[PDB]
Amino acid sequence: SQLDKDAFEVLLANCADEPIQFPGAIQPHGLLFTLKEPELTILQVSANVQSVLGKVPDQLAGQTLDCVLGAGWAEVIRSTSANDSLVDVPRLLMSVEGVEFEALLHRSQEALVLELEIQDKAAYSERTGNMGRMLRQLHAAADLQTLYEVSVREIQRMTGYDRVLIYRFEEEGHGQVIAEASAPAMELFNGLFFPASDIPEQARELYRRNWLRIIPDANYTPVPLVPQLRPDTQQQLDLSFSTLRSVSPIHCQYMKNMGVLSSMSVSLIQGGKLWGLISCGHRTPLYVSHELRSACQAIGQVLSLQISAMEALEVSRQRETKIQTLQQLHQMMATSDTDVFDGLAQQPQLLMDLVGATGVAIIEDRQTHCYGNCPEPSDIRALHTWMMAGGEPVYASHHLSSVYPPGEAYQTLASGVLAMSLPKPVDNGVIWFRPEVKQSVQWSLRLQPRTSFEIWKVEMTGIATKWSHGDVFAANDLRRSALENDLARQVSKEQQAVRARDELVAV
Amino acid sequence: QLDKDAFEVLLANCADEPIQFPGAIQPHGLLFTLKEPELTILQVSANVQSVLGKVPDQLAGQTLDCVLGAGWAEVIRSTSANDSLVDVPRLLMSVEGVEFEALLHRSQEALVLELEIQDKAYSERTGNMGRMLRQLHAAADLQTLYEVSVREIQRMTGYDRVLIYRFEEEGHGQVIAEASAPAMELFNGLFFPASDIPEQARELYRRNWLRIIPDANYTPVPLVPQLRPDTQQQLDLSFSTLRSVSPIHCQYMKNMGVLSSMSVSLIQGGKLWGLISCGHRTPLYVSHELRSACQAIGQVLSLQISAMEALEVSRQRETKIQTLQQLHQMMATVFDGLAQQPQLLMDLVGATGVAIIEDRQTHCYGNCPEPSDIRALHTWMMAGGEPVYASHHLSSVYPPGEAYQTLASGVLAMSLPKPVDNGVIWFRPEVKQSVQWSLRLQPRTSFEIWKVEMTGIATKWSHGDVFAANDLRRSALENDLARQVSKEQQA
Ligand SMILES: *C/C=C1/C(=C/c2[nH]c(/C=C3[NH+]=C(/C=C4/NC(=O)C(C=C)=C4C)C(C)=C\3CCC(=O)O)c(CCC(=O)O)c2C)NC(=O)[C@H]1C
Ligand SMILES: *C/C=C1/C(=C/c2[nH]c(/C=C3[NH+]=C(/C=C4/NC(=O)C(C=C)=C4C)C(C)=C\3CCC(=O)O)c(CCC(=O)O)c2C)NC(=O)[C@H]1C
């Protein structure tokens, strides 16, 4: 209908600052209660109480829990809440009015948030053996990529979900799918990149503050919270930590377009930062039991530490190689005995791997020796003069188009440069080149992954992979090695001062 | 007196004990050596005559169904379908009115099977693992991680004492964390020599995750026959849960006051980082579920230690650069300027005394030797000519270095290639200074033996520690070599 689309257009237009932390509604697979701290006085209740527990929500507000959940259950819950910090609380599978309810408790804004999750009747030794199997398989991962596919495949084996993907968030937000174990007759999303605008900052904060996000129904009607605002606090309700939180209609539409209806994502956090996400998707809606989502919560913590451990080892492994090859070039520089830059020119292949690049252009006056994928010599000549205007010793930039506007015709080859030139008056230098990230990636309406990929393409124009701290350190230290050898040649020019006394002696 | 003569023989020769080939298995189980074709019994445990009521001499050389059962032999053959016996689940069995747990592995082309006996007399287990993972995730400092891990393991398995040992650079073991029941001798901070854990034991713990000894006062059961007919050489038990421990370690545990032990190996980068050793005063057996619970902890905890340490390696090395560039900036403004701020020099590499030796005078800062003998120390290193000299055992190669071993046992000095003898020397203290603790195989003797074996050895200079010294000399070299060109500019 025309009325329905009008609200969607406003919501879709303004999605970066949509207050998803205060949805004002919850998913229909649970009941939400706000309880006052001293006497468990009900502040606001989800309108689902009419459907289950058979109580009109108008007069339910302001009364004790005993009025709806019974005296004994309310006493048990009050005893559990007081002086417990609501951390690692054992599951309380209560049963009121013939409906099984799993009770999850937390607190926010000096109030108690109580979630009663309905357990389907149709829906431990086996689970324990599975956890050990997963721990063994994850520990056996020799490489990071092997860890990715092993983890994705075995999560699919555990949960039976029709798709499991792992997104890794790069430096500027953009996420990339790095592993996938999908059910037959489904799309292949491996290698796809999506823009950082696809996930808002509020969503990133919510994923960092939680571990599991479960959306059992994409085609779900949001049950509102009556009253919308808290009576005592005179404000909205904070549902950041609430499992029963309304998802934005934009994301529901996006999930429907992809073909998924039930989703479950496990956050991956390293050092207080969101490394990525483990997205599990299904076609037929399904509800994940407490045992299943307690196991997958433990999966994320194991993976987050394991990924962090291998990331540091890879950093150390490459850094040791950087210092190993840095000494090798220094030895080549000293024993070259031909020119300051000739020794580097003798091994162009080794020069690239020192920093990580695709082409180098070692320059000595009027001779622009270029190796690997590189622009035409005139542009390399042109690019050199721009950096000497600044006078900086080492200049690293992964976005040449936005700092050097004429560096656009060759942005497909030289999108990030790293140049080191000794301060001697004559021209000099070694310039490294990196390609656009968009060239490496190869992947097969709106609110679809196909549209997301194109938006990433138009935003990643002229951006190369960032120069790592080791890469800049490698260039900076090579400058010291070149400078140390350059001043040695200045010592060798004392032979001129040796002959100066010789032709003065004859006089 | 017969045991005393035999026991003392083994004590002298401990580094060559064939612990991988004991020939005996612990009484809490029966081990059968099986052949793939039709499940022929190669070797059978001695206690099969008691628990199973079959003659060990007669039971050798027939089908496993005779002692186990036709259906049980069938299911064993089914699960052991040449599938590497890695992902085998639990196969609870009941033969002759007793309950068994089946373990399978393959050594020297076999199908060796272990039947573990459990005592006749869930949601919390999954919740315990979740709480354990959450608690380690919440930890930030390494010491906090050790404390919380030890406390959590002690709560989970119920053992009276739990300790974490870490193996240092040389090989000696140091107890880092400990959480124990009251009225027992604390062992935190104690150091024991590498001789307590032989190389064979180190390799076996490297190739295993869990090593359990339920009863210390046990009589090993003899494997019969003692030679495999297909190899005529003792059965390889290096991957077997049921394995008789060396009596030296039995005596060690008895003297230390523990009768049940359960050690979880900690492996990082394929190397034995340490051990999580649990001990109980009363013989306490374990269940199948608890074996996997503590096994997973060692895998999880070893992952954090590798990650937490590597974060500290980077953090320490970044702080060096901030200190390194500070000196380089101070260098430009040939050695006198450095004497203004000597404090950051020690923090640059980790030290306690720094000596500046250029031209004639010498400056003594921090805990440093006497200037007279310091000058003698500088004279040696110039003969070698190395740009940097790294050594942690000065008395090992510098015999006069005995009068100031406590003051300085390890040195890291750099000198300039220019002819005039000028350089800077750093010092480290002995390790024994910072370690304090309260044939008599006791922890106290091991600390006494360690103190003897740790004389004159200081903390090893890390790769980053030497790298800072190599970089600092380049800062002095650049200024000196710049003035070398200035010497040309003079004329
Ligand atoms: C400006 C608003 C928009 C928006 C909002 C939004 N997105 C999410 C969650 C997403 N969206 C993802 C986008 C994708 N990009 C891809 O390439 C694919 C599939 C291959 C997807 C699905 C994405 C990965 C997530 C995280 C999901 C997860 O696994 O956790 C949210 C959060 C909603 C919530 O309640 O958590 C919001 C608000 N989406 C848009 O497309 C733009 C218009
Ligand atoms: C020269 C050989 C000897 C020997 C053999 C031996 N020891 C072990 C196992 C040990 N021993 C440990 C020693 C300790 N040092 C201490 O300071 C403390 C306590 C404060 C102890 C217990 C030690 C920690 C282990 C590992 C225990 C574990 O369960 O992993 C073995 C291995 C036995 C095996 O079956 O694997 C051997 C062969 N011990 C000696 O003391 C000397 C004489």
**Secondary structure string (H, E, C) spanning A284-351:** CCCCCCHHHHHHHHHHHHHHHHHHHHHHHHHHHHHHHHHHHHHHHHHHHHHHHCCCCCHHHHHCHHHH
Nearest to B130 among A297, A306, A308 (CB): A297
DSSP sequence for A364-387:
ETTEEEEEES---HHHHHHHHHHH
User: What is the C-alpha to C-alpha distance for residues A167 and A278, in angstroms, rounded to an integer?
Assistant: 7
Residue of B nearest to A300 (CA): B133
Handedness of CA B291, B297, B298, B300 (dihedral sign): positive
> Do A490 and B491 make contact, defined as CB atoms within 8 angstroms?
no
A-chain CB neighbours of B125 within 8 Å are: 124, 128
Rounded-to-integer distance, Cα B301 and Cα B308, Å: 10
Half-sphere exposure in the Cβ direction for A497 (13 Å, CA): 12
Are the beta carbons of A252 and A220 closer than 8 angstroms? yes
User: Which residues pair with residue B267 across a beta bridge?
Assistant: B272
Which token pair is A93? 């599978």
Resolution, expressed in angstroms to one decimal? 3.3
Cβ–Cβ < 8 Å for A493, B487: no
Question: If residue A450 lies in a helix (H) or strand (E), which one and from where to where?
Answer: helix A449-459
Whether the CB-CB separation of A378 and A418 falls below 8 Å is answered with no
Question: Which superfamily does CATH assign the domain made up of B334-490 to?
Answer: PHY domain (3.30.450.270)
Q: Check if the beta carbon of residue B51 is closer than 8 Å to that of residue B231.
A: no
Residue B155's identity, in one-letter code, is R
8 Å CB contact between B195 and B177:
no
Q: How buried is residue A299: exposed, middle or buried, by Cβ count under 10 Å (0-12/13-18/19+)?
A: buried
Residues of B in contact with A298 (CB under 8 A): 129-130, 133
**Residue of A162, A199, A248, A258 to mutate, ligand 1, most atoms within 8 A of C-beta:** A199
- Interruptions in chain B after residues (C–N over 2.5 Å): 121, 333, 438
A363 pairs with which residues across the strands? A368
Residue B367 vs residues A40, B335, B434: alpha-carbon distances, Å? 65, 20, 15
CA distance A287 to A268: 22
What residues of chain B lie within 8 A of the CB of A323, using their CB? Answer: 467
HSE-CB of B419 using CA atoms within 13 angstroms: 1
Which two three-digit tokens encode residue A215? 């959306």
Q: How many residues does chain A have?
A: 507
Atom of ligand 1 nearest to the CA of A452: 17
Instruction: Return the closest-CA partner of residue B471 out of B358, B340, B331.
Output: B331
Cβ neighbour number for residue A393 with a 10 Å cutoff: 16
> Could you say which ligand is closest to the alpha carbon of residue A279?
1
CA B95 to CA A427: how far, in whole Å? 88
Burial A300-314 (b: 16+ CB within 10 A, else e): bbbbbbbbbbbebbe
Mutate to test the pocket of ligand 1, among A20, A214, A246, A254 (most ligand atoms within 8 A of CB): A254
CB contact at 8 A, B46 and B55: no
Give CATH superfamily name and number for A123-232+243-312.
GAF domain (3.30.450.40)
Separation between Cα atoms, residue B274 and residue B205, nearest integer Å: 10
Residue A198 CA to ligand 1 center (angstroms) comes to 5
Short-list A395, A413, A396, A394, CA closest to A462: A413
DSSP code of residue B361:
-
Question: Is it true that domain A337-498 has CATH number 3.30.310.10?
Answer: no
How many Å separate Cα A449 from the centre of its chain? 17
Least Cα separation, residue A260 to chain B (angstroms): 29
Give the number of C-alpha atoms closer than 13 A to the C-alpha of residue B323, restricted to the C-beta side: 22
Question: What's the residue count for chain B?
Answer: 491
Closest alpha carbon within chain B to A142: B269
- Ligand number nearest to the C-alpha of A257: 1
Chain B CB contacts of A322 under 8 Å are: none
Residue B455, H or E segment: none
Q: Which residue of B has its CA nearest to A125?
A: B122
| Ligand nearest to the backbone CA of A197 | 1
Q: Which two tokens stand for residue B132?
A: 């354990």
Q: Residue-wise over A177-199: b if at least 16 C-beta within 10 A, else e? A: bbbbbbeeeeeebbebbbbbebb
Q: How many C-alpha atoms does A348 have within 13 Å on its Cβ side? A: 16
Query: Going by CA atoms, what residue is nearest to atom 18 of ligand 1?
Result: A449
> Ligand 1 centre and the CA of B64: distance in Å?
59
Q: Do B126 and A131 touch (CB under 8 A)?
A: yes
Inter-residue contact A28 to A228 (CB < 8 Å) = no
Distances (CA, A) of B9 to B12, B199, B247, B484: 6, 19, 12, 69
First to last CA, chain B: 91
Backbone angle region of B78, left / alpha / beta, with phi > 0 → left and psi within -120 to 50 → alpha: alpha
Torsion sign (Cα): B119, B275, A154, B140: positive
Task: Say if strands B260-268 and B210-213 run parallel, antiparallel, or are unpaired.
Answer: antiparallel
> What's the gap in Å between B310 CA and the centre of ligand 2?
29
All residues at 6 or more sequence positions from A335 whose CB lies less than 8 Å from its CB, including other chains: A343
Report the residue from B131, B307, B477 with minimal CB separation from A305.
B307
| Closest ligand to Cα B244 | 2
Q: Are A377 and A371 in contact (CB under 8 A)?
A: no
Chain breaks in chain A (C to N over 2.5 A) after: 123, 444
CA distance A196 to A456: 8
Q: Where are the alpha helices (DSSP H) in B262-392?
A: 288-332, 343-349, 371-384
Beta bridge partners of B477: none
A42-to-A29, A136, A239, B332, B397 alpha-carbon distances in Å: 20, 47, 16, 71, 79
Contact across the interface for B306 and A313, Cβ inside 8 Å: yes
Contact B134 A90 (CB under 8 A): no
CB contact under 8 A, B295 and A132: yes
- Which residues in chain B touch residue A494, judged by CB atoms under 8 angstroms apart? 488
B122-310 and B334-490: identical CATH topology: yes
Strands of the sheet containing B98-105, edge to edge, are B41-44, B30-34, B112-117, B98-105, B92-95
Between CA A420 and CA A383 the distance in angstroms is 13
Q: Is residue A230 within 8 Å of A34, Cβ to Cβ?
A: yes
Domain locations in chain B as residue ranges? 122-310, 334-490
Q: Which atom of ligand 1 is nearest to the CA of A20?
A: 38
Alpha-carbon Rg for chain A, nearest whole angstrom, is 31
List the one residue out of A500, A482, A502, A503 whose CA is nearest residue B490: A500
d(CA A323, CA A197): 38
How many other CB atoms are there within 10 angstroms of residue A112's CB atom? 22
- Token pair of A71, please? 């005296």
The closest residue, in CA terms, to atom 41 on ligand 2 is: B196
Other Cβ atoms closer than 10 A to B266: 24
Show the DSSP H helices in A39-173 as ranges: 57-60, 66-69, 71-81, 125-139, 144-159
What whole-number distance in Å separates Cα of residue A124 and Cα of residue A82?
Answer: 30
Cα–Cα distance, A94 to A118 (Å, whole number): 10
CA A169 – CA A174 distance, rounded (Å) = 6
First to last CA, chain A: 107
- Number of CB atoms found within 10 A of residue B70's CB: 11
CB contact set of B199 (below 8 Å; sequence gap of 6+): B15
Spatial separation of the C-alpha atoms in residues A293 and A267, rounded to whole Å: 12
Return the closest-CA partner of residue A44 out of A26, A29, A20, A21.
A26
Pick the residue whose CA is nearest to atom 28 on ligand 2.
B263
Phi-psi region of A98 (alpha: psi -120 to 50; beta: other; left: phi over 0): left
Say if domain B122-310 classifies as CATH 3.30.300.20.
Answer: no
Which residue shows structure tokens 């026959």?
A: B225
Which residue in chain B has the smallest CA separation from A270?
B137
User: Which of A474, A487, A233 is closest to B482 using CA atoms?
Assistant: A487
Distances from the Cα of B144 to the Cα of A198, B129, B160, B179, angstroms: 38, 18, 21, 13
Q: Which residue of B has its CA nearest to A130?
A: B89
- Structure tokens given for A316: 């150390």
Instruction: Please check whether residue B47 is in contact with residue B117, taking contact to mean a CB–CB distance below 8 angstroms.
Output: no
Most distant CA atoms of chain B, gap in Å: 104
A216 three-state secondary structure: coil
Question: Which of A128, A304, A315 has its CB closest to that of B292?
Answer: A128
